[PDB]
Structures are given as C-alpha cells and as structure tokens.
Design a protein around this ligand. Structure first.
Ligand SMILES: Nc1nc2c(ncn2[C@@H]2O[C@H](COP(=O)(O)OP(=O)(O)OP(=O)(O)O)[C@@H](O)[C@H]2O)c(=O)[nH]1
Ligand SMILES: Nc1ncnc2c1ncn2[C@@H]1O[C@H](COP(=O)(O)OP(=O)(O)CP(=O)(O)O)[C@@H](O)[C@H]1O
Ligand SMILES: Nc1nc2c(ncn2[C@@H]2O[C@H](COP(=O)(O)OP(=O)(O)O)[C@@H](O)[C@H]2O)c(=O)[nH]1
Ligand SMILES: [Mg+2]
Ligand SMILES: [Mg+2]
Ligand SMILES: [Mg+2]
Lengths: 54, 441, 339, 419
C-alpha cells in the first residue's frame, strides 16, 4: 500500500494511496434556436387570434 | 490566486446558496456586515479565501456570487435577511413571473429575454478576477428556472468563457418534497442540453437528504431549511480545498482530473459522515475508521444507490478535523478487505486523501452537532446510473401518453427535443453499462 | 391491505405464494408495472433493483437478492470459491472445477489432468454450463469450442442405492429472509436414477445424470423403485439405518448444513440488505452429491428453484410465514431449520 | 405581487361570488368597510393577490360584478359586505337574459361586454404582474353562462398569455329553474373547453344531496348550496392566498393538474361538511364529500391536489394520504408518477380547527357531461324550445356542433379511463 505526494501545510495535508496499479453551439447558433422557438410561439398565438377573429 | 464565481439559479439554487455563504462566513470569520477581523490586508490580498471573496477598500468581503431567479420572492429574503449587507444589488437578479415548472418557459420564453442581463452581471464579477478558474452553478433539476434557464446559461458560458471549468451542484427531484409532476421531463431536458457543458456535477437527491434528516437528526418532517443546512455542509467540504490552503483539489480543473476520466460520466457520488443530532447532549465521537467505514453505507450517500454492484473509476476522501494520515491508511486497509470495492480495470485502485485540520463548522441554532472529525467521499461509481434509470423510467411512463407535452410545445419547444433528450439519456445509461457491468430448476 | 405484484408467470413456487397471499383477504395483486407495491415477485432476469425502495411511505420487499447470481451461475460459482478467502482453492466439499472459454483456466486444467491419467488415477471429467462426460481431455475441450463452460471432476465413486445400484442427487431448499437468517426446509428430495450405474459407458447419460429432466424423456425404469424417481428424507433415512447403520442427520445433513452456511455467509457482505432502502429474501435450490464414503459434495446452487409437487403446500406456506408476513404482519410449529 | 382579477356574472355567479368575498375577507381580517383588523401577519402576506390597497390601508377586492339585470347587483350592494366593492365595478344592464344563452352571448350580452372589458382593463392596468382571471357563474342560465363565456373569449383575445380559471355551477333537473338549462350548459361547456385553463365543476345536484343526505337539511335553499360553494372556493384558493410552495400561482397549478389541454375540468371536495387527520382524509375522498355528483370509483384520477388547513400532524397527513391511495390504487392512473400532491396551511377556516379541500382531475367527470348531453338530446331531437334561440339569430347548426363537441369531450375522457 504505497503512499505518494504527501504535502503538508499549516492547515492540513494531502496524499495518495495506491492499492494496485491499473489492469459546442456558437453564439449565433444559440440565438437562432431561441428565435426559432419564439417564432413558433408567435405563430401559435397568431392562429389563436385568427381563431378568435373568426 | 485564482477566483471562483458561484451562480445560483432558481429557488433551490438561491436558497442553497444562502445556506452555503452563511456557512462560508462562519468558516472564515466573516461577519454579516462583511467585516473580517482576521484579514490583516485591508481591502486586498490574494489569500485562499479570496477565491470566493473580494474585498472593498472599506474591508468588506463580498462573495463572488450572482443570484438569479425569474421571480423575486426567494431573492427578496436575501436582500432582507441576516447577510443582506454582504451582497450588492447588482449581484441579485430577479424577474417578474417564474417558469411555472416548465423547462421550455425557463429556457426559451423567459430565458431569451434575461440571459443577456445575467451574463452582463457575471462579466462585472469576471472583470474583478486576475485569473478566473470557472463557475460553480447551483440549481434544481425539477424547477422551470433551475432546469431551463440553467442549461441556457451553461451554453452561453461555454461561449463567453471557453477555457473555464464549470461545476454543478444539482438537486435531483424526490416526491417526498416535490412540487411538480413534470420534474422528470425537466430533469432529462436540462441534463441533455447541459451534458456537454458541465465538467463535473454533484447530484444531491432530496430523498437522501430527507431521510438523513429524519433518521440522523430526528426531524419528523424536515423543511427546506433543514435540508439546505445539511446540503451546505457537503458543499462546504467539497469546496473547502478551493478557499483553504492545501494541495488537493486546489483548482477546479483538478476535480475533472481526479474524478472524471470519461467526460460524459461526470457525476460523482457524494457520501458524508457523521451527521449527528444537536439535541443529543453527549454523543460518542466517531473515530477515523468509523467515519471512513460510514462512507460505504448506502444510508449516508447523497443519492440512494448500491455501490457494491457498480465499479469505481475514482475515489477521493476529504477529511475535516482531527485526522492524521496514518489513521486514514489504517482505516482504508480495514475497509478494502471487508467491503467489495471493484475498480474498473483501466483505472488504479487508489484513494486521493485530503485533510483539513479545521473541524466542520456548524451554524449556531442548527440541527447538526459539533463533531471533532468528519469526512466526505467523492467516488465516481457506476452505481449512480440507478438514478438515471429511475428518472428515465418516470419520463417514459408520461411521455408514452404525451402527458403535459403541450405545455412545452406551447412555449415554442419542439416535441422532437423530448425524444432527442431521451435518446441521449439512453446512451448515457449505456455508457455506464459498458464501463460497469461484466429458470424453473 | 398489503399490495404485491407478479412479474414471473412461470414460477410455480411464487404462483402458489401469490395464490396463498390472496387467500388471506389482506393482500391485493396489482398490475405488473404498478410501482405502489409492498412486495415484488420479480422476473428472473434483469430485475430492476434500482427502482425499489423509492416510493414515499412504502416498505418494499423483493423475492431476490441482488448479486446472488455469483453463487447460482456455474462459471461464477467456481470463481467465487477459488477467489473467496472464506472458501479458498482448498475447499474440500466442492469438486475440482475449472472455467474454460471457447483470465482463462484452460491451461491450468490440463496441468492437473496430466497428473491424473498419468498416475493411473480415475480421470473422468464433466463439462457443463448440453452435458458431456469424457475420459480424456481431448474430447472435452472440443465440445466447448464447437458459451462459457466449466470442466468439473466427475464423482466416479458415487453412493449407489440398493436395490438398483443407482446414483442420485439431493436437493435442499433454503430460505434467506431480510435479516439474512438462513432457513433450511426440513424436507429434502433425492432425485434418483432408475438405471444401474455403469462405470465404463459414458455415452449413455441416463444413469449418470439424475435430474428429473432426463429421468423421464430417456429413463427406462421411471417410477419402479420410487414414485417419480423421488425418494424423500423419511425413506432415505430409514434406508441409511437399515443398509449402513447410520442416520441421514449424522452421515449427510451435517455436511449439507455446513455447506449452506459457508456459501451464504461468504457472500452476505455483498448482497445483504440490512442497511438498504429496500429488503430482499430468496429461495435457493442446493444440489448435492454423496460419494461411497458418505462425504457430501456441492454440485450447484439454483436461484429460481422448483419444488416437489408433494411439498409445495408446506414450503410455500413456510415462505409466506418466514419471508413475507415477518415484514408485513397479519391480523409453533416450524418447518425450517435455522442455521 | 401576482394579482388575480375576479369576475362574477349573473344571478348564481354574483350570489356565490358575494359569499366568497365574505368568507375570505373574514379569513384575511377585512371588515365590511375594507379596514384590516387581523392579528397575524400571515393574513396580509399575500393580501394583494385578491385585494387592492387604498389610502388609509383599506383593502378593496379586485372584483368585477356583471349582470344583465340590476336585481342581484342591488342585493349584493345592500348585502353584508356590499360596501367593500368598488362602486364603479358594478356593471349591469336592465333587459335581462331570460335564461337564454343566446341573449347573454350574442344580443343583450353584446351591448354590455365592452364596458365590462373597460373595467377589467382598468383593474389589470394597476397590477404589478397579473397572474390571470377567475370567473364565478352558472352554466344553466343566460348571463353567467352566455355572457360569461363571451367575456372569457374577449379576455383571452386581449390577454392571450394569462391564466383563465372558473368556478362553474352545472345545472341539474333536481335543482332546476328552467327546462333550457341543458341547452345553455352544453353551449357554455364548449366555450370552456377552448378558452379556460382550469374549471372547477360545481354540480347543483351534488350540492343538494350533500345538504339533504349528509348535512340533514330537510329543504335546502340556494343559500345553503352557496354555503358549500364559498367554503369550497376558500379552500381551493388557500394555497394562492397564503405562503405556499405547491400550486403557488395559477400557472404552476395548471401545469401540474392538466396533462391534456381539453381535460381541465376538476371535481372539488371539502371536509368536514374536532376531526382527526384520518377522518378528514377518509371523508374528503368519499364521493359524499365531492360536489361534481360523480363517483370517482367509476373513473380514474389523472391528478389530485389536497390542501390541509389548521394545526395537525404533518406525518399523519402523509401517512393517511399515502395510505388512502395505496389502498384503492385502482383509481389512479399509473402513467403519471406521483400524481397526488399535498399542501398544508396553518390558518384554519372560520369556525373549524382543521379542514381539508380536495381538487381532483378525474375521468369520472365524464358522467357529468354525459348527463348534460343526454338531456340536451332529449329536447334537441324534437327541436323543443329552440325558438327562444333562433329568435336571437342562432341557427340549429350551432346546436349540432356544440352537441358533437361535448360528445367528443366525453369520448376523450373515456380513452384515458381505459389507459
Ligand atoms: N434541497 C432543496 N430543494 C429545493 C429547494 N427549493 C426547491 N427545491 C426542489 O426543487 C424542485 C422545484 O424547483 P424550484 O427550484 O423550486 O423551481 P425554480 O428553479 O425556481 O423554477 P420555477 O419556479 O419553475 O421558475 C423540487 O424538486 C423541490 O423539491 C430547496 O430550498 N432545497
Ligand atoms: N461432478 C459430478 N460428478 C457426478 N455427477 C455429476 C457431476 N456434476 C453433475 N452431475 C450430475 O448431473 C446432474 C445435474 O447436473 P447439473 O445440476 O450440473 O445440471 P443442471 O444445472 O442443468 C440441473 P438443474 O436444472 O436442476 O439446475 C446431477 O443429477 C448429477 O448427478
Ligand atoms: N348553487 C347555486 N346555483 C344557482 C344559484 N342561482 C341560480 N343557480 C343555478 O343557475 C342556473 C340558473 O342560472 P342563473 O345564474 O340564475 O341565470 P343568469 O342570471 O342569467 O346567469 C340554474 O341551474 C340554477 O339552479 C345560487 O345562488 N346558487
Ligand atoms: Mg421558482
Ligand atoms: Mg442450474
Ligand atoms: Mg335566475
């Protein structure tokens, strides 16, 4: 059970024990996705107002 | 010295951030007014605690934090509470009406109109950093803001801060304290779009925190306050390495290097011990071996699951209080024999150990008892996939009938995003299966 | 009113358990996919253990121990015995076995083989996982290559019942409840072969394999000496007294109980649900061989065993008392032996 | 500040509405003159959801009173709390609606609707962040039913992204005024299917039976029925009027109660009609405590919201709740996990130490729409009483479509009851 990388300071210490060795979307793309959704919302709201106008 | 900026999104993120910064101040000797008598460098210094606190010329220590919520009730209690003097108005952002537990409302409808403001306020904090490490993002899975606006913010952060690590503290939904029935939808949706933007996420299942509060703290019906003070203890021991002198997990990058070899599998399991009720006058002080052994009992984990049937890819032990290396080594030797701890063949069978001599701090008047030594184990085990399976199954039950889907399509989201998100989760579950697993007689 | 679900239609045991449950007025059967259950009679394969114990206010119990396959898969059982320090490769009640793929043991198997047929010693092995009993290692490895298999030493000196000169195996039923109590059903069964044991002809496997499967499709004397080639403990005990002047308890049952304890205690740390968010119990079928020295040998452990038609009523009722009602009470005399 | 605009239309709508404001005004500590005389800050915490504040800290209900004849309006103004409403929020005509949906929706109603919208527009203008609207009305008459649904249609056109909720009183032959009530109710239900987000179905037959069988009232009046409704209205709005985390606002409640846009008609319940937690739980779930005159054992619950008021064991509440559903579990759909949510308010209603209010989205509600459809077709098959409607410009075709629309609604509930 080896112990490696023992660092000691005034507020603590750290070490490592080894028991055995081993065997994106851009700004404009995000803006489009947001405006696409907004567009589908405005379309659905236009169909509503159209429905109510009838 | 490199700075960390904390971002709290939604009611869960904001109220958990409240408990954390309250605890951070108690741990660093910072009073509610922001004064820190121990900081001999007035209005300056690049000490370890300055990773989370900036200093005005008047000696005020201001958290490097921004609170954001699409509805002002929760953030109004920050502006009016004990630590109101801590933050300045620019870092507390509130909207008018919330996302109604609707991912599409938080991400698209409302997020599109507030995202630029949030980034501007973050840039203000970034402009105060000589070497920004990255961000710590707190949020729920199930809320409309915690899920929807978080994933939009994470996308924009990868753009504005390409070479910066992003860590998550995510609240996994539990019916025992759940508000909405659509939280499985919001969890899958936000995990899918956030997956490629988060370097390491610590999931906390409210069901686990709830039972710990009932079993260990003798609280018959825990509230969010009880839950959040316990959560802040775990968060504190996880971030202690960033704001105290030390050599383990001193940089946000180190969390990825030590806990996440496989990028998509970046959800470490957290286990904390001991949690002892303050109503118990005298309680038996647990030893190093006892609390270390407690890190392998399912009842102390932040996500209920059985590590005995997964495989470990990395294991990290974080001690606070009266602990010395030989006590830890002796305890591990005792545990590696009894309990079954199978590491993946392509990873060393070892443990990174960090010790902080300061015992865990407890908020006066809280439910947790002062202990002389505590430990938090971070282990990246495939057993946490059980949490994805559960969640994915609730998603499937509702989506087969398209129940509640119209609320999401009504906010401009396409029905295809559901299946796209679900198939990504199916691939995530298979990634765990590959790394992990090997009638009528 | 307790609720349970049935996810294995083929289980003859838990089909009776479900029948007894409903016959009490305090249990109601729900749809297979209803999550608000107290008791799951789960499927044999891919039982979703990860979805148990997460329903608010429901104490949930399942009739399988997650991880018990390590003991009930022929390949993994060998690996468990050779690997577990509690059992070790010196374990004296498990026949010398080797795991061979079509990490592999094909090499070590041939080493100990040469030491046998060279030393005049009986060198007969049985490969299984489609069974084959051969004299030389040549024909054995060819059968596997042409799924993973296990080559095991064949018990060439079995205890033969008289009259008949015929081999047999013993089946013991063991119930392990949620507290990990190990209960041995007081009633076992001997699955006997109706044909005389032939030491030279390994081609005909009707007198070498005793399972009820072969002793019917290919048994020429099915039911001659005992109904359905099934001798129960009372008769077998009386025989041991008459023929050998010994008791079933002393000559055999002591070794059986020791073997059951050793296997289940070995894996308890891995499968126990003591501190788990759900609870488990499971019925096991242990299969034993007895040699002519009255030494008991473990053959295999079955995780979803069937029962003797004559014993379903008692065992199934005993399961309900010890495993189900213990957790979910209702509004002595005991058929099990606590180990 | 998430304000709700309240509208009450017609005789039934205004009499039930008046009692509603009387009950909650008492709960929030508001006297008949709008002045506050409470003793708990929890009262004023969310007072602005239903009340505007004027100088002198007098609170004025955000309520609009609508009718096509003055009678009921005058009775409210002279009523117990009649002085509490803004005088200019009374909007009424003189002609009347003659229990005729066409008069309320197309002729008499059309002349008054714009001035009603003027008042609605004024109340909304002074809202920090308008949640939505709630309407009280009956479906069996002319003004509440015909003009009420006209108002909903106009409100939706002007505030298309606000929540629209209603308490709708369904007619019954056992508590009937005119024979044309199935006509008016069938026409209104279609308007509600399209333009409301949440409708609390209040069946006058259930109200009567409760007053007769349970409450032991020999001869119940409309007043007795209105006692049950205002108590129900106070309970279902408790989580809106006091500090709460579940069903906090109208849109969050809709998102968690309405899995399919057309199936948004809820069965309310109340208890008691002191008691222990198991008693409240058992009673609140028994049909005899539900006001839709529908047996939930005949259908399946899509979602359920329960509100407990008073000081009680929070553990007993969960245990009884988790008990009541885990017993008769056949009546909850299995494809909406965790579809029963529970909230608790500390402030009990006047005269009770603890009560429980029940809000169910059950497919059993189809029995109500089927009753109305059967009564509609018995008369429509012979074109009985149609001249009252054709005389107002309506064509028979519009009746045929409303019939098919409600029968479509019934069959839609029947699909999810089998699933
Ligand atoms: N642990 C913990 N969980 C919380 C807290 N607040 C909310 N939650 C959980 O978060 C989920 C609800 O999401 P919220 O964060 O409240 O909603 P939100 O992010 O504000 O989004 P919207 O309100 O829909 O705009 C539920 O599963 C809650 O149990 C909290 O303070 N602590
Ligand atoms: N090493 C050995 N020596 C002698 N006989 C053996 C043996 N291994 C197996 N047998 C014989 O084989 C028969 C059953 O073999 P085994 O139990 O391995 O197959 P199986 O697992 O398909 C039976 P089941 O369906 O009940 O689990 C027994 O009757 C036994 O007599
Ligand atoms: N519960 C209740 N129902 C009423 C009341 N007044 C009328 N109704 C019912 O409402 C229907 C008559 O509609 P009404 O409101 O009087 O017509 P309107 O004034 O034109 O809207 C019938 O079904 C009545 O039974 C009341 O005060 N309480
Ligand atoms: Mg919120
Ligand atoms: Mg077998
Ligand atoms: Mg009338």
């Amino acid at each position: 059970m080896e112990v490696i990388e023992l660092n000691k300071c005034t507020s603590g210490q750290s070490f490592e024990v080894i028991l055995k060795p081993p065997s994106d979307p851009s700004l404009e793309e995000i803006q489009k996705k947001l405006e696409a959704a907004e567009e589908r919302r405005k379309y659905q709201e236009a169909e509503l107002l159209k429905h109510l106008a009838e | 010295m490199r700075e960390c900026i904390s971002i709290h999104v939604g009611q869960a993120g904001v109220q958990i951030g409240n408990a954390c910064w309250e605890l951070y101040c108690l741990e660093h000797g910072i009073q509610p007014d922001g004064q820190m008598p121990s900081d001999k460098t007035i209005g300056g210094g690049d000490d370890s605690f300055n990773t989370f606190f900036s200093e005005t010329g008047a000696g005020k220590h201001v958290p490097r934090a921004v609170f954001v919520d699409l509805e002002p009730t929760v953030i109004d209690e920050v502006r009016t509470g004990t630590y109101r003097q801590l933050f300045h108005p620019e870092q507390l952002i509130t909207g008018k009406e919330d996302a109604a537990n609707n991912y599409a409302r938080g991400h698209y409808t409302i997020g599109k109109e507030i995202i630029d403001l949030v980034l501007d306020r973050i840039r203000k904090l970034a402009d105060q950093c000589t070497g920004l490490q990255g961000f710590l993002v707190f949020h729920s899975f199930g809320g409309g803001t915690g899920s929807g606006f978080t994933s939009l913010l994470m996308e924009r952060l990868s753009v504005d801060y390409g070479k910066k690590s992003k860590l998550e503290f995510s609240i996994y939904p539990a019916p025992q304290v759940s508000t909405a029935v659509v939280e499985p939808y919001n969890s899958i949706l936000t995990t899918h779009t956030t997956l490629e933007h988060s370097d390491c996420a610590f999931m906390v299942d409210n069901e686990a925190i709830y039972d710990i509060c009932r079993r260990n703290l003798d609280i018959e019906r825990p509230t969010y306050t009880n839950l959040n003070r316990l959560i802040s203890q775990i968060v504190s021991s996880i971030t202690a390495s960033l704001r105290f002198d030390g050599a383990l997990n001193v940089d946000l990058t180190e969390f990825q290097t030590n806990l996440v070899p496989y990028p998509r599998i970046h959800f470490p399991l957290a286990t904390y011990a001991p949690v002892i009720s303050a109503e118990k006058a005298y309680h038996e002080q647990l030893s190093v071996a006892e609390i270390t052994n407690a890190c392998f009992e399912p009842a102390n984990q932040m996500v209920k699951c059985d590590p005995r049937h997964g495989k470990y890819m990395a294991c990290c032990l974080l001690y606070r209080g009266d602990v010395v290396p030989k006590d830890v080594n002796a305890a591990i030797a005792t545990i590696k024999t009894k309990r079954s701890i199978q590491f993946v063949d392509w990873c060393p069978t070892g443990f990174k150990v960090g010790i902080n001599y300061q015992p865990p701090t407890v908020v006066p008047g809280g439910d947790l008892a002062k202990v002389q030594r505590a430990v938090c184990m971070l282990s990246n085990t495939t057993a946490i996939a059980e949490a994805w399976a559960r969640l994915d199954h609730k998603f499937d039950l509702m989506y087969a009938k398209r129940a509640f889907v119209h609320w999401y399509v009504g906010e401009g989201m396409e029905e295809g995003e559901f299946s796209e998100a679900r198939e990504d989760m199916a691939a995530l579950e298979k990634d765990y299966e590959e790394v992990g697993v090997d009638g009528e007689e | 009113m307790y609720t349970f679900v049935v996810r294995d239609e083929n289980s003859s045991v838990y089909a009776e358990v479900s029948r007894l449950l409903l016959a009490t007025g305090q249990w109601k059967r729900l749809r297979k996919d209803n999550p608000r259950f107290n008791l799951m009679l789960g499927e044999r394969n891919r039982l979703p253990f990860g979805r148990l114990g997460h329903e608010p206010g429901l104490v949930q119990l399942v009739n399988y121990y997650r991880g018990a396959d390590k003991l009930c898969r022929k390949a993994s059982l060998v690996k468990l015995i050779k690997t577990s320090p509690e059992l070790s490769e010196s374990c004296t009640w498990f026949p010398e076995s080797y795991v061979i793929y079509p990490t592999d043991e094909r090499e070590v198997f041939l080493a100990a083989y040469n030491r046998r047929r060279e030393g005049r010693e009986g060198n007969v092995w049985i490969a299984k996982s489609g069974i084959l009993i051969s004299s030389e290692a040549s024909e054995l490895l060819d059968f596997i290559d042409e799924q993973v298999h296990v080559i095991q030493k064949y018990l060439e000196k079995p205890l033969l019942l008289e009259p008949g000169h015929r081999k047999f195996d013993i089946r013991s039923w063991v119930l392990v409840d949620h507290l990990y109590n190990i209960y041995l059903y007081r009633e076992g069964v001997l699955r006997t072969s109706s044909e005389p044991y032939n030491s030279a002809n390994f081609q005909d496997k009707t007198c070498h394999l005793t399972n009820h499967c072969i002793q019917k499709e290919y048994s020429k004397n099915y039911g001659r000496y005992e109904e359905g080639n099934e001798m129960f403990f009372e008769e077998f005990n009386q025989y041991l007294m008459d023929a050998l002047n010994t008791t079933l308890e002393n000559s055999i049952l002591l070794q059986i109980k020791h073997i059951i304890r050793s296997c289940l205690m070995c894996i308890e740390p891995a499968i126990s649900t003591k501190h788990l968010h759900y609870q488990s119990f499971q019925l096991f079928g242990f299969d034993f061989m007895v040699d002519e020295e009255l030494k008991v040998w473990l053959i295999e452990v079955n995780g979803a065993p069937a029962c003797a038609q004559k014993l379903y009523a008692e065992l199934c009722q005993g399961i309900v008392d010890v495993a189900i009602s213990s957790v979910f009470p209702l509004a002595p005399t005991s058929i099990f032996i606590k180990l | 500040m998430r304000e709700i605009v309240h509208i009450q239309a017609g005789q039934c709508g205004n009499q039930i509405g008046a009692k509603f404001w009387e009950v909650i005004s008492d709960e929030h500590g508001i006297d008949p003159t709008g002045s506050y005389h409470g003793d708990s800050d929890l009262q004023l915490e969310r007072i602005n959801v239903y009340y505007n504040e004027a100088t002198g800290n007098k609170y004025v209900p955000r309520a609009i009173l609508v009718d096509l004849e003055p009678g009921t309006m005058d009775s409210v103004r002279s009523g117990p709390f009649g002085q509490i409403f803004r005088p200019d929020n009374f909007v009424f005509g003189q002609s009347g609606a003659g229990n005729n949906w066409a008069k309320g929706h197309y002729t008499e109603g059309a002349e008054l609707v714009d001035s009603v919208l003027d008042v609605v527009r004024k109340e909304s203008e002074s809202c920090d962040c308008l949640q939505g609207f709630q309407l009280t009305h009956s479906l069996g008459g002319g003004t509440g039913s015909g003009m009420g649904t006209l108002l909903i249609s106009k409100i939706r056109e002007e505030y298309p992204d606000r929540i629209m909720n209603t308490f709708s009183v369904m007619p019954s032959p056992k508590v009937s005024d005119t024979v044309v009530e199935p006509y008016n109710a069938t026409l209104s239900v279609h308007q509600l299917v399209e333009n409301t987000d949440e409708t609390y179905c209040i069946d006058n037959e259930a109200l009567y039976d409760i007053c007769f069988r349970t409450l032991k009232l020999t001869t119940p009046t409309y007043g007795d029925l209105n006692h049950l409704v205002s108590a129900t209205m106070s309970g279902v709005t408790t989580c809106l009027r006091f500090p709460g985390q579940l069903n906090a606002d109208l849109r969050k409640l809709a998102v968690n109660m309405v899995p399919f846009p057309r199936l948004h008609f809820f069965m309310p319940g109340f208890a008691p009609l002191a008691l222990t937690v198991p008693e409240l739980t058992q009673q609140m779930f028994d049909s005899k405590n539900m006001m839709a005159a529908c047996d939930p054992r005949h259908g399946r619950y899509l979602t359920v919201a329960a509100i407990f008021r008073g000081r009680m064991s929070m553990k007993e509440v969960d245990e009884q709740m988790l008990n009541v559903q885990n017993k008769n579990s056949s009546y909850f759909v299995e494809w909406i996990p965790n579809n029963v949510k529970t909230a608790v308010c500390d402030i009990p209603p006047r005269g009770l130490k603890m009560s429980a209010t029940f809000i169910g989205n059950s497919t059993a509600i189809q029995e109500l729409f089927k009753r109305i459809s059967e009564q509609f077709t018995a008369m429509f098959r012979r074109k009985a009483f149609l001249h009252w409607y054709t005389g107002e410009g309506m064509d028979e075709m519009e009746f045929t479509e409303a019939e098919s629309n409600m029968n479509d609604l019934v069959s839609e509930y029947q699909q999810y009851q089998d699933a």
